């Protein structure tokens, strides 16, 4: 997404505990599956949202992997 929103996403993710982080990823993964459904019926005009959520999930798992590895 926008570069400032990535930065804010990383500040907030880093204030989350591993349990919060897992629960967020589980939520964003659900929304990603919702995006794939929508895109498969031709309903996702804004297809950039699929990639954005995928990288979001990557950042969150990266920070989750950070917090179990200081």
């Amino acid at each position: 997404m926008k570069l400032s929103e990535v930065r804010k996403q990383l500040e907030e993710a880093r204030k989350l505990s591993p349990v919060e982080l897992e629960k967020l990823v589980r939520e964003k993964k659900r929304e990603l599956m919702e995006l794939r459904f929508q895109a498969s019926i031709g309903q996702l005009s804004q297809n950039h949202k699929i990639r954005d959520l995928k990288r979001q999930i990557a950042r969150l798992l990266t920070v989750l992997n950070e917090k179990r590895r200081q």
Binding site: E22, V25, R26, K29, R30, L32, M33, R36, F37, S40, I41, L61, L64
Partner: protein, 95 residues
């Protein structure tokens, strides 16, 4: 992280899959290495239903070419889940 949303990939959009909604059988594209027990738990976490039967089948990719370049579409796997009596998956009854 491995969630139910990693097992279930997309619904199967075909007149054959649609004809199964009436009996409570919903067809999904699922992950190729996912077992029947896994798909059961993944549907029951994803769509708030009870799964009483899961059939599965592998669907080999179609060989295709583009001019000089012969290739192959990825392999896929379909799962058909039967939900408990009187239940329904609203995200599919769409359609």
């Amino acid at each position: 992280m491995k969630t139910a949303y990693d097992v279930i990939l997309a619904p199967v959009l075909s007149e054959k899959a649609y004809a199964g909604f009436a009996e409570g059988k919903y067809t999904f594209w699922v992950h190729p290495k996912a077992t029947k027990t896994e798909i059961k738990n993944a549907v029951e976490t994803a769509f708030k239903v009870k799964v009483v039967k899961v059939n599965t089948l592998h669907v080999r990719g179609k060989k295709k070419r583009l001019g000089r370049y012969l290739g192959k579409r990825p392999d896929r796997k379909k799962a058909i889940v039967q939900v408990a009596p009187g239940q329904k998956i609203e995200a599919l009854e769409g359609l």
